[PDB]
Amino acid sequence: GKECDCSSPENPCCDAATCKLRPGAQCGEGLCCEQCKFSRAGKICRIARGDWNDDRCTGQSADCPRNPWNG
Numbered sequence: 497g498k499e500c501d502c503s504s505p506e507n508p509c510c511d512a513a514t515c516k517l518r519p520g521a522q523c524g525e526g527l528c529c530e531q532c533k534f535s536r537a538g539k540i541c542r543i544a545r546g547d548w549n550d551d552r553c554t555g556q557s558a559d560c561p562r563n564p565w566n567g
Contacts, residue, residue, distance in 0.1 A: 501558075526558025527551075534558060 500515030502524035509524030509532040510517050517524055521532030526540035528534055535541075537555025544550050548565045 523558030526557065527560035528553040529558045 500510070501517050502510035502515065503527060504510075505512045505515065507524045509519065509521045517532070519532070522534040522559075523529035524532055528539065534556060536555050538551055539555070540549040540550050541542030541553040541560025544563065544566055546565075549563050551560050551562060554561055
């Protein structure tokens with residue numbers, strides 16, 4: 497389970513041997529991964545098609561969380 501931070505085995509930000517971050521980068525790929533770094537929270541990681549609420553970046557997670565109405 498915890499043995500890979502990037503789903504790309506050709507990404508330089510994550511050691512392919514372990515599949516995790518090789519350098520001191522917080523993340524190799526993700527909506528909140530700016531320059532392999534964790535973007536800030538409250539960041540529109542994604543929009544919402546319809547009329548509810550877009551998606552705010554957590555700031556501590558590489559990917560982005562979702563609302564209880566997006567399915």
